[PDB]
Amino acid sequence: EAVTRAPVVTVMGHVDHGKTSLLDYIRRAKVTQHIGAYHVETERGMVTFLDTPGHAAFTAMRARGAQATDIVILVVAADDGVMPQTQEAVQHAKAAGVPIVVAVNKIDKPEANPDNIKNGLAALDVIPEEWGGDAPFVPVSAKLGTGVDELLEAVLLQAEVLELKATPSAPGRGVVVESRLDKGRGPVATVLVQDGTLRQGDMVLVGINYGRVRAMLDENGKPIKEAGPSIPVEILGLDGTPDAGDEMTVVADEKKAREVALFRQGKFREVKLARAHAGKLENIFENKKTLNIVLKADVRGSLEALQGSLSGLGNDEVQVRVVGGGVGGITESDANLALASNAVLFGFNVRADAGARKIVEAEGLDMRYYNVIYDIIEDVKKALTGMLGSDLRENILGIAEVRDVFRSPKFGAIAGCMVTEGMVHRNRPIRVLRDDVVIFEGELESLRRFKDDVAEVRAGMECGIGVKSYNDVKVGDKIEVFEKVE
Ligand SMILES: Nc1nc2c(ncn2[C@@H]2O[C@H](COP(=O)(O)OP(=O)(O)O)[C@@H](O)[C@H]2O)c(=O)[nH]1
């Protein structure tokens, strides 16, 4: 007993390219409210969609050890194709080998030629199915509606090539898409069943949480008694809100459920400490392994130069291959990608965000900032040969956030600020960063509070700061102060 269950499609692409519009058009044109997933049936078969644009949540639920997605559809606007963020989607979908279907969206415009997309995307191992072929190219239009049926046909044709094996008789097993709390009904989950069946009444374990399905809502808001092999449902009964990547399984009784939950929490507690020591760049050589890196530069040119330089490294003892690469700060999505791929973070003139910081703290993965290009490559080659491993170089002691700017016309750029980390003192170099990208690098000019010139400010104390031979310090910047460790 075995049948083809369903394909699961995730929509990814650049911002403002039509992900939400394409996602909504199929839902509103095939047959309110949203739960996190839905499904539509065609003549050849039925396919399910996760109504959440990807490249962010696609990896978030993958780093926990679950792969609900088996088809990824890229959307690129005909007008202006392939943005420095479609490449990020390509790398995210290539880290976990999944079929990709490309669908140009904005073809209902004068300047909407698709051939520049076809050959520009061709140099990404996404060559079209007319010259070589590993991915189709169907033109759709979310607003007008043309070409969608061909898109569904292409998705189904790509899917039928894969395994598509499931048994709609075994005890249910699946993954949770999203969870939410409500004063009525308490905690609510949006589990996606993958194999078996989830008839109402079963004893359900989801990660740490456990319970039973006292109520079940379908995707359209109507209660149902049974769940298919790949039909998303919304269950009630768990004792706490689950995460977005846990596994839902059917067990026998509550005692076994509690034993498994305690074992799972113990294992999760134990796993975290291993990455905090075995995941560092100084321990990769010790214990091929194809060392992976994630790079976040500040300017595209430096990123291209660094990728070109890091090309010819690694012959027989460990190899190097970048799995990321983008312009901007270290987004939490990049940290999730590195965690799922067991890579290491490299930050060129960029700082991690709050979410990136908390993900780094939880996963305990290596994360280092670098100032000059050649230090990155020298550290990479030194770690490849595995000779030395220590911090040094620089250590940030004190970060201050500007509040307001009152630059006086008497050749001054005095900016008010409040210290949010560490302490700031006079005779150290400073570093002004806006939008997590550094803009200036130099010393100070004045750090008085009102007129005292304290030359040392404790954390949490408002003061005024002055940058030497620099201006245009807007509101919302940060000043970090560091030491060139010798
Ligand atoms: N002319 C045209 N415009 C489109 C089409 N699809 C989307 N758009 C435009 O895209 C905008 C919506 O962008 P949206 O999908 O929300 O961005 P996203 O969520 O980041 O993918 C709308 O204002 C539409 O004008 C299309 O097929 N034709």
Q: Is 463 left (phi over 0), alpha (psi -120 to 50) or beta?
A: beta
Domain coverage including residue 87: 8-31+33-161
Same domain, 74 and 152: yes
- Residue of 51, 140, 143 best suited for mutating to test ligand 1, as the one with most atoms within 8 Å of CB: 143
The backbone torsions φ and ψ at residue 102, rounded to the nearest 5 degrees and listed phi first, read -95, 130
Cβ density class 356-389: b for 16+ within 10 Å, e for less = beebbeebbbbbbbbeeeeebbebbeebbeeeee
Amino acid at 373: I
Last residue of a domain, one of 133, 161, 189: 161
Long-range contacts of 251-254 (CB under 8 A, 24+ apart): 251/203, 251/204, 251/205, 251/210, 252/203, 253/203, 254/203, 254/210
- CATH classification at residue 370: 3.40.50.10050
Same domain, 258 and 315: no
Same domain, 12 and 140: yes
Tell me whether residue 275 is in a domain: no
Same domain, 320 and 206: no
Does residue 118 line the site of ligand 1, with CB under 6 A?
no
Same domain, 155 and 188: no
Does residue 143 line the site of ligand 1, with CB under 6 A?
yes
Both tokens of residue 12?
Answer: 């990814």
Give DSSP secondary structure letters for 296-345.
EESSHHHHHHHHHHTSS--SSS---EES--EESSB-HHHHHHHHHHT-EE
Same domain, 150 and 242: no
Specify the 3-state DSSP secondary structure of 61: coil
Helix (H) or strand (E) holding 155: helix 148-161
CA of 141 to the centre of ligand 1 (A): 9
Tell me whether residue 230 is in a domain: yes
Same domain, 260 and 226: yes
Would the annotation count 133 as a binding residue? Answer: no
Last residue of a domain, one of 161, 181, 198: 161
Output Rg (C-alpha) for the chain, integer angstroms: 26
Cα dihedral 285, 288, 289, 292 in deg (nearest 10):
80
Same domain, 433 and 322: no
Helix (H) or strand (E) holding 361: helix 354-363
Same domain, 101 and 83: yes
d(CA 374, CA 380): 10
Tell me whether residue 3 is in a domain: no
- CATH classification at residue 108: 3.40.50.300
Does residue 108 line the site of ligand 1, with CB under 6 A?
yes
Same domain, 372 and 407: no
Same domain, 329 and 408: no
Does residue 21 line the site of ligand 1, with CB under 6 A?
yes
CA-based nearest residue to 117, from 208, 261, 28, 13 = 13
Q: Which atom of ligand 1 is nearest to the CA of 75?
A: 21
Q: Which atom of ligand 1 is nearest to the CA of 144?
A: 27
Would the annotation count 108 as a binding residue? Answer: yes
Tell me whether residue 168 is in a domain: no
Same domain, 376 and 315: yes
Does residue 19 line the site of ligand 1, with CB under 6 A?
yes
Does residue 85 line the site of ligand 1, with CB under 6 A?
no
d(CA 206, CA 236): 12
d(CA 258, CA 297): 46
Q: Work out the end-to-end distance of the chain between its first and last CA atoms, rounded to an integer number of angstroms.
A: 68
Would the annotation count 107 as a binding residue? Answer: yes
Q: Name the residue with the closest Cα to ligand 1, atom 9.
A: 18
If one counts the domains in the chain, the total is 4
Hey, CA dihedral for 322, 324, 327, 329, is it positive or negative? negative
